[PDB]
Structures are given as C-alpha cells and as structure tokens.
Amino acid sequence: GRLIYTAGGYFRQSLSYLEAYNPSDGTWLRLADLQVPRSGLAGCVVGGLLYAVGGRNNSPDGNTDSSALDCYNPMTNQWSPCAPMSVPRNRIGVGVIDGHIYAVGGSHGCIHHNSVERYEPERDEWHLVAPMLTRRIGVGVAVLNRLLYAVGGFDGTNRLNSAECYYPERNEWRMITAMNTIRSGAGVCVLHNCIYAAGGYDGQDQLNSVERYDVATATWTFVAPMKHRRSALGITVHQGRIYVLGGYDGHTFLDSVECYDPDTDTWSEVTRMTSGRSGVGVAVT
Ligand SMILES: CC(=O)N1CCC[C@H]1C(=O)N[C@@H]1COC(=O)c2cccc(-c3cccc4nonc34)c2CSC[C@H](C(=O)N(C)C)NC1=O
Ligand SMILES: [Cl-]
Numbered sequence: 001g002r003l004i005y006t007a008g009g010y011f012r013q014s015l016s017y018l019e020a021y022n023p024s025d026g027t028w029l030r031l032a033d034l035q036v037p038r039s040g041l042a043g044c045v046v047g048g049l050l051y052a053v054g055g056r057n058n059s060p061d062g063n064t065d066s067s068a069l070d071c072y073n074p075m076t077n078q079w080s081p082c083a084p085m086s087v088p089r090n091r092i093g094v095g096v097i098d099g100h101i102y103a104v105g106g107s108h109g110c111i112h113h114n115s116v117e118r119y120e121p122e123r124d125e126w127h128l129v130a131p132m133l134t135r136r137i138g139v140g141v142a143v144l145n146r147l148l149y150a151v152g153g154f155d156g157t158n159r160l161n162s163a164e165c166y167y168p169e170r171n172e173w174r175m176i177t178a179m180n181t182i183r184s185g186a187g188v189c190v191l192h193n194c195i196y197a198a199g200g201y202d203g204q205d206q207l208n209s210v211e212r213y214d215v216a217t218a219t220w221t222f223v224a225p226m227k228h229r230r231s232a233l234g235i236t237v238h239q240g241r242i243y244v245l246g247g248y249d250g251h252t253f254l255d256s257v258e259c260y261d262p263d264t265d266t267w268s269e270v271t272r273m274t275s276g277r278s279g280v281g282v283a284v285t
Contacts, residue, residue, distance in 0.1 A: 002284050003029070004236055006245055007052045007072075009277030010039035011253050014057045018072065018079075019274060021257070023238055026271055032077045038066055040232070042094035042141075043281030044101055046121055049073055051082070052281050053103055056090035065090045065108045069101075069119060069126075074285065083124045085117055091185070091279075093141030095148045097168055102129070104150050105136035112137050112156035116166070130171045133164055138232075140188020142195045145215065149176065151197055152183040159184045159203040163213075179220045180211055187235030187244050192262060196223070198244055201231040206250045210260070224265045228256050234282035243270070248278040 003020040016033035034052060041055030050072040056065045065088030071080045089106030096102070101119040103126075105112070112135040117128045136153030143149075148166040150173075152159075161182040164175045179197055186200030186207070195213040197220075199206065206229040211220045230247030233254075237243070242260035246253065253276035258267045 039279035
C-alpha cells in the first residue's frame with residue numbers, strides 16, 4: 001500500500017496542505033498541514049519518512065525564502081523540524097542517494113544557487129558538496145545509476161535546456177547531452193532506467209511536451225505530450241507509471257493529475273487534486 005503525497009504548493013499564496021492519493025481506490029487523504037506554508041519546495045522519502053525541503057512562503061503581507069527541512073511520519077501524522085540547510089532554496093530540486101538527501105540549486109532573493117548540499121538523517125546534519133557547473137533554480141533532479149542529474153532550470157539570466165551529472169564518489173559534476181527543449185520548472189523523474197523531463201517553461205510558453213534521456217545512447221527523445229501545458233508541476237513514479245500533479249498553465253492553477261503509461265506511450269487524467277495548485281513537493285511511500 002503506497003500513497004502519492006503532495007506537500008505545500010501555491011494558490012493565491014503558499015499553502016500548508018499535505019494530502020495523499022491512493023491510486024488503487026482513487027481516494028484522497030487530508031493529512032496534518034505543514035507548520036509553515038511553502039511553495040517551490042521538493043519532497044522525498046527516506047526510511048518511510050516524507051521530507052519537505054526548501055521553497056518559499058509567499059503571503060499577501062510579504063515573502064520569505066525557506067532553508068527548512070521538515071520530516072513527516074505517516075504513522076503518527078506529525079511533522080518534525082530537522083536541521084535547516086546552509087541557505088534558503090526556493091524552486092529547489094531534490095534527489096536521494098543511499099538515504100542521503102541532496103538539495104540542489106534554487107534561489108534566495110536575487111541569488112541563483114549553483115551550490116548543492118547533502119543531508120544525513122542519522123546525524124541530522126547538512127554538508128555542502130561540489131557545486132554545479134551552472135546556477136539552476138526551477139531545476140529538475142533525478143537519481144539514475146547512483147548519479148544525481150540536475151536538468152534544465154534558470155540561471156538568473158537564461159532559461160536552460162542543459163543538464164549535468166554529479167558523481168558522489170568523485171565529488172564532481174559533468175555536463176551531459178542537453179535536452180531538445182529549454183525547460184525551467186519541469187517535472188523530472190526516473191522510470192525504467194530513463195530520465196523524463198515533462199513540461200516546464202521555455203521563456204515564452206508553458207509546455208506540454210515530454211522528453212526522456214537514454215543513458216546508453218545519450219540522447220533525449222520526445223515521448224507523448226501531456227494533455228495540459230504545465231510548469232511548476234509535481235512529479236513522481238508509482239507502480240511503473242509517471243504521475244504529474246498540478247502546476248500552472250500561464251493563467252490557471254491546475255488541479256489535474258495525469259498518468260503516463262510507458263507501454264502504451266499515453267497520458268490519461270486519473271484524478272483531480274482537492275484544489276488547483278502549483279509548486280508542490282511530491283513523493284511516494
Ligand atoms: C510572478 C511570480 O513569479 N510570482 C509573483 C508572486 C510570487 C510568484 C508566484 O506567483 N509564484 C507561484 C508559485 O509557483 C512555484 O512555487 C514555482 C515552483 C517551482 C517552479 C516554478 C517555476 C515555473 C516555471 C519556470 C521556472 N523557473 O524557475 N522556477 C520556475 C514556480 C513558478 S510557476 C509561475 C507562476 C507565475 O509566474 N504566476 C504569475 C502565478 N508562479 C506561481 O505559481
Ligand atoms: Cl514563488
């Protein structure tokens with residue numbers, strides 16, 4: 001029994017929602033709210049615990065970038081604060097290698113980070129690792145072959161189609177083949193040994209196109225596009241399928257949840273979130 005969790009997001013302001021979707025029966029669970037609202041955060045799971053990393057709290061009274069790391073226990077329905085990151089990281093990308101959380105890029109006011117840091121739950125400590133070759137906010141992150149890939153994003157001046165790879169044993173970054181499309185705020189995940197980059201923003205329009213990276217051929221190829229154009233979407237993999245949750249299409253905050261079946265190369269709307277939102281953190285446990 002595994003659930004798709006969605007934490008935070010944005011609709012008029014940053015949200016505290018923590019909701020879980022059960023793909024087997026189509027039900028939505030309303031769980032304990034985040035202590036501090038956040039959009040542009042990322043979610044991940046380590047040892048059956050859900051983590052909400054970074055983001056920013058946008059309120060009609062003012063905005064605050066977050067360096068926070070919070071931990072949710074599904075068995076207790078409780079959030080617990082963890083050690084914060086060295087810097088606030090809004091529009092962050094996160095990846096897990098060997099139970100260690102990597103917080104990648106993101107922004108803090110006028111600063112677009114290339115810095116990357118790693119959290120060890122067993123010690124409750126963050127330590128900086130080698131920074132990326134490019135500053136990246138709205139970066140998609142995927143873990144494949146025990147390497148951490150940072151895909152697309154925005155460097156402060158340009159929207160990116162470039163992507164790079166981190167080798168944890170060597171503590172170094174290398175540029176890989178660039179995507180066909182410039183994407184900032186895309187959903188990046190790994191399914192069947194491929195990295196998928198779905199949606200995002202190319203500097204002019206929100207995208208519905210989806211491309212996947214094959215490591216053996218080192219090429220990015222387009223697969224079937226989503227029904228809705230979306231940036232700042234949440235993304236996850238559950239039982240061999242890709243799930244995209246919410247986002248922003250340029251005017252509307254989507255409640256649509258689409259599901260990609262790699263066998264048929266088709267997307268279908270499987271459910272709707274309880275309300276439309278963008279910039280959510282998503283994870284499965
Ligand atoms: C104009 C503007 O940016 N806004 C003014 C008030 C604050 C702020 C505001 O509305 N943000 C909320 C939240 O959204 C996210 O959390 C969020 C999270 C993760 C990634 C991204 C993202 C998408 C596309 C390219 C990106 N390159 O880097 N990150 C990218 C976003 C922003 S989606 C764009 C939409 C917007 O511009 N509106 C006007 C509503 N923004 C949002 O939905
Ligand atoms: Cl924002």
